[PDB]
Amino acid sequence: VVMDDHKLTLEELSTKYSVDLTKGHSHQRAKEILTRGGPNTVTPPPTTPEWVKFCKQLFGGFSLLLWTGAILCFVAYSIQIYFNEEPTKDNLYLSIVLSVVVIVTGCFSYYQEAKSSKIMESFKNMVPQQALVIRGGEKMQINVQEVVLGDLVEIKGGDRVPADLRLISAQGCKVDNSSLTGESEPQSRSPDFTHENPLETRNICFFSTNCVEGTARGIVIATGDSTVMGRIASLTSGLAVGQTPIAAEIEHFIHLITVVAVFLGVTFFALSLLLGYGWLEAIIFLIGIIVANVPEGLLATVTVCLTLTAKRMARKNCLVKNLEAVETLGSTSTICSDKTGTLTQNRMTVAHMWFDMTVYEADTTEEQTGKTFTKSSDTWFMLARIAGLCNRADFKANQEILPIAKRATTGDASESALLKFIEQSYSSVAEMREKNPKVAEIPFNSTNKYQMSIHLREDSSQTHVLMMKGAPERILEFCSTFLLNGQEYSMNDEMKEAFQNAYLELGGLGERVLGFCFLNLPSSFSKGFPFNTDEINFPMDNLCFVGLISMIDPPRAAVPDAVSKCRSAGIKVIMVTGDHPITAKAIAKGVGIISEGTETAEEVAARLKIPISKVDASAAKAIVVHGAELKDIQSKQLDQILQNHPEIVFARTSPQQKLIIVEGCQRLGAVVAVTGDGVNDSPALKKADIGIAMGISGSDVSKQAADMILLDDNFASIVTGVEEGRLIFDNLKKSIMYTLTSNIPEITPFLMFIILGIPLPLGTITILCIDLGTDMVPAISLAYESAESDIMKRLPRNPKTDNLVNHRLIGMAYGQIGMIQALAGFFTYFVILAENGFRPVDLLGIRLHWEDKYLNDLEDSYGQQWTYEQRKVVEFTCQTAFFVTIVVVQWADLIISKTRRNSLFQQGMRNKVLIFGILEETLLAAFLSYTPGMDVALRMYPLKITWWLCAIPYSILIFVYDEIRKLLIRQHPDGWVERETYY
Amino acid sequence: KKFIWNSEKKEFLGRTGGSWFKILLFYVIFYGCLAGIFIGTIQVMLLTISEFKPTYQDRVAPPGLTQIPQIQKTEISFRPNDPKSYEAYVLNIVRFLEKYKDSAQRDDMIFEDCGDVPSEPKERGDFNHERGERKVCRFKLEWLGNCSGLNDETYGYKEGKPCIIIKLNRVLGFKPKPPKNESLETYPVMKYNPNVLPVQCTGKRDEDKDKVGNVEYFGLGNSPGFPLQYYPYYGKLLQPKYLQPLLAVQFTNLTMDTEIRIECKAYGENIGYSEKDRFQGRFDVKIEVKS
Ligand SMILES: C[C@@H]1CC[C@@]2(OC1)O[C@H]1C[C@H]3[C@@H]4CC=C5C[C@@H](OCCC(CO[C@H]6O[C@H](CO)[C@@H](O[C@H]7O[C@H](CO)[C@@H](O)[C@H](O)[C@H]7O)[C@H](O)[C@H]6O)CO[C@H]6O[C@H](CO)[C@@H](O[C@H]7O[C@H](CO)[C@@H](O)[C@H](O)[C@H]7O)[C@H](O)[C@H]6O)CC[C@]5(C)[C@H]4CC[C@]3(C)[C@H]1[C@@H]2C
Ligand SMILES: CCCCCCCC/C=C\CCCCCCCC(=O)OC[C@H](COP(=O)(O)OCC[N+](C)(C)C)OC(=O)CCCCCCC/C=C\CCCCCCCC
Ligand SMILES: C[C@@H]1O[C@@H](O[C@H]2C[C@@H](O)[C@]3(CO)[C@H]4[C@H](O)C[C@]5(C)[C@@H](C6=CC(=O)OC6)CC[C@]5(O)[C@@H]4CC[C@]3(O)C2)[C@H](O)[C@H](O)[C@H]1O
Ligand SMILES: CC(C)CCC[C@@H](C)[C@H]1CC[C@H]2[C@@H]3CC=C4C[C@@H](O)CC[C@]4(C)[C@H]3CC[C@]12C
Ligand SMILES: [Mg+2]
Ligand code: NA
């Protein structure tokens, strides 16, 4: 409720809330308002119970396909039970197996996401927050939830602001609004109307901000959900979740598979009716054919591949809260990033120095992994001693594991920055201050604009040295001599304008400049001279100037390289911040969002001296958009802005406007990633296709809204995420191709049983042993394939056109490789039946006699007479050999699925998981064939040596065919072979 | 997404006529090559298959034991008073026994007389075409006695004394070995002929053993079983018109209106049995003569 309370007079404020601004609310009025208007708490986002999350895992695209398959199998089994005589339990087995696969995969995914949620909950901590309210005429330490509208609240330094406040009294109050507004530097607070916008006026304090220094008193104008943070929370809660890009790809794949399965089933249903089977048998055939196309083992494969990528990312302190988020960065075309706390450290840091007529550039990185400056002159030693001794700041308790930049201190941001800079450049400041004990303090204040101090000199002079720091134009009037190379010269005409040429230069960058001086007091004061601040017992003139130090909020060390890599990957990087346009533009230039040499229209106009309309729209590749302009921008104008400029900076933007920008980018067909840390990024983080929040600097609401957390606030993890997402997309393509290839040798035996009336070449048990057995580890091992080229040199995939599964993959798996695999199994089937006495021509149309349980003298090609059990054992041996042949030809399929463009001799065989998978599937096939008792448990029988060798020529054929195909693809880019087969 | 049947671009289902022609031509050539490769591999394999002897016989040996009539569920249920209750049985028997008539075994270049008493197996050469087709021992219908069908054309079904014809499944080169020194089982069996593979039909349960009446065996010689001069069998290529020896079993004193479970078993050193295959070396038959 900050609509008008800032522009209200001190009398109307008292009348509006029926309170007097010296005594506060009556001790009963507060209780009445508490019980009539509710507590001072923002309502948390709704909490979903565990079983609902588990059931959400149990359903979904692939899971629903497997559920449909299980239901169809159960219906088929019911029909067989009701109408047929002695039906087998194949369909019951299939129903149970499909249900169990769905349930186990759901359990696995739920467990992974619950682990991530537990880590997030452990990170979130609660400490009882209490406020200070002037109730009953005295100070009370009430709980934060009991603060009511109109309450009189006093805030001191280091105190969180309890609610939205309209300040009436203040004494040097400064608050940190970086999380709410995006302003890094603390903002001064005064009890007067300054700006029309409530977020800019200096007489309003907002809930969820920290008071940094001073003290103030104010009236509560908004409570709970009516606060600025609460409205942002409601806006975030009112947003839909949205579908991840990988989920859409899985949905498209399910559509394709359903179409293929239904077409095959209906065509063979019609064929069965034409061949004279019967409606019931035709329905059974239709259900079986439709179910046989369902790849029940591919669901677990996809889940495991996503989990492996998630664990790989977690190894690098990158937490994903769901498995589908592990791919989104690979598909990202646009990154919308906040500046303060996200691209920037959100910490005042020394940036430049000016001494010895020279400008030195400090190392602003957190780990000090940059360029040093010249530290040989003793003027640098004097400057370091001054800046470290006249500081009044100190590290806090324990931060010795942490780097100096990341440590916590006790004092002003400027004092902390000076302390850290001196600590990481000159020497330890604690030892310096021990060697130079203080005598007189003379604290800093605004009116004086300087901080004097007196210390015992380290050089063993037994005397004292006065050290002064403050505003450059303030301390210059006191110093009549400067220091050039440790030589105490005097004031020249040159050394009174180079001071104004460097101050105007370091102050022109938006940085906060400071001056330093010393005097080296005469020996008449000895050691224990009474130094009285209230009088002039010590000289305060003709100081010796040393140098200037400037400070600014710097970018994070990894940010510029990450931005450069993302732009090399074809990703558009947009800066969206709530800070001032000058700071935003400076940071955008510093991190590469605005490239070197690119100009804005307002700069081309000032260079060519032409009106902004006369500016050509070909040299203004960069634009800076103020948030005030966005209030009068329509969808069409926003689309024009987003399309016509490669480099865009949005400054002074509200959370609602960040959401609008993200929605506009998504409306143009882009997959959008948002990186932010403050509460002003939460709606954009939730609306984004992938939301990434900083683990350390981020707020709880933004970390709840985000899909991914950078636990160490490392921006280099985004490039790794893009690379991993692209690689996971490619490897999913390979794994899906490998899994879909084996479908053809699994359904063609049943098709030929129906059409030709031959004994069934492959059984349900062997088919299950392929899908959930020998094919699982090889399919998983394709997730460990390395990139065949530089994936970061590709453009982002077009989601409309570039699909995970398309018609090329179907044609390769079903039409070409699956057919060769199917012919390999039929060859072994025929060789076994011919070696046992049934020539291939004699097996055509034998189904009715072969399946007759009471025909026990069936005649073979030689005139031998067979019992039903004997020929069934022969058929089961043929099915076992068909299964083994499928295993053998899947060796070649796995070898050729390693690459989509490269030859095997180019990529090599460095995937150890693939080799292990080959060995494991071979050993599993051998185990099921030769283990005693496997003829009773399963219908699997031992094989002859030569029956293993029947699939070698077909495997070699598969390998040679794929090698030639990929050679042609490589030789003829964009040619017919590539357009038809390169999936 | 759902409107691709026709388009301004002359695109049928997404592709033009030229694209459709190219993709269909590619698949036609690819499947023709696959079919050629498959046919070639099949022919190369068949080159290694002998035309006179199967490569393996461990799945067909030991042979099974079957019976005529070919019944539906090992059940024989008929009423002697109703001639239509056993017409199917009698028709099945006469259809099976047509090739055993004397008039069908007249060619002296195909058939021969191999004695009226059981004899040792006859070695007719090696499994090849060295001497063309092998000769076939004759089997007379008169050996089947009252189940021969030469006097009673109903095989005892009209009288209520049904006949079953027992046969041993043909296996190439298989020579049955009768049990050694009468050391298999005990019954009023003339199991002293070393040239007969003994066969016996008994009641399945102890209840059945008391309700089966007299069992009559009709065959070559006085020993119930298969004479050994009809073995080995050389296959349908070398020995077409081959006749396997037959044993006729007639149940003359069956209890009426009750279902009788009967087990017929063959005995030999190379004759085996199984709990999974109920027809290997033996079979079960259920017979109910209704009053
Ligand atoms: C960590 C990972 C996770 C994943 C995973 O790995 C580990 O998890 C693993 C967990 C696994 C499952 C675990 C548990 C089972 C249940 C099991 O249950 C079968 C039990 C068998 C029953 O046992 C007896 O059955 C008879 C009992 O009388 C015995 O009969 C003889 O002896 C009798 C006297 O004793 C005489 O009276 C008889 O006359 C004479 O015959 C017989 O010898 C003996 O075997 C099933 O047998 C039948 O097998 C076929 C079933 O359809 C039938 O064929 C039919 O369909 C064919 C086409 O399919 C057509 O070609 C055929 O024409 C048409 O008939 C076949 O007929 C029939 O026998 C079937 C397999 C399954 C689902 C597993 C699959 C694989 C996994 C998913 C693994 C998976 C890889
Ligand atoms: C058994 C021995 C080991 C296995 C060896 C297999 C070798 C081949 C295997 C894979 C390679 C891919 C399939 C073969 C492609 C050969 C044709 C070819 O390379 O295309 C080059 C030409 C022209 O060049 P372009 O299209 O780049 O440029 C022109 C652009 N314009 C046409 C698109 C608009 O394109 C055209 O004529 C396209 C029109 C012709 C389409 C039908 C071609 C049928 C030929 C072969 C099919 C498979 C036979 C072998 C089957 C083995 C059984 C396993
Ligand atoms: C004409 C018909 O043929 C036989 O029956 C057929 C239908 C049905 O009975 C079954 C047993 O359920 C079917 C079933 O339908 C579909 C399958 C489970 C299917 C799938 C595999 C997979 O992975 O997903 C789906 C492929 C075939 C299948 O494996 C079995 C194979 C054995 C068979 O027996 C075959 C009998 O002889 C019957 O008596 C006669 O009427
Ligand atoms: C071309 C090559 C690589 C195919 C694989 C060859 C080997 C590994 C395969 C082919 C034949 C198989 C053997 C067949 C016979 C037997 C005897 C049996 O009592 C134990 C398993 C054992 C010893 C198998 C071991 C594994 C073996 C599976
Ligand atoms: Mg921020
Ligand atoms: Na999101």
Numbering used by the authors:
A (entry chain A): 47 to 1029
B (entry chain B): 13 to 303
Cite, word for word, the article reporting this structure.
In addition, the binding pocket in Na+,K+-ATPase α4 for ouabain appears to be smaller, which may explain the tighter binding and higher affinity that Na+,K+-ATPase α4 has for ouabain.
Na+,K+-ATPase is constituted by the association of two major subunits, a catalytic α and a glycosylated β subunit, both of which exist as different isoforms (in mammals known as α1, α2, α3, α4, β1, β2 and β3).
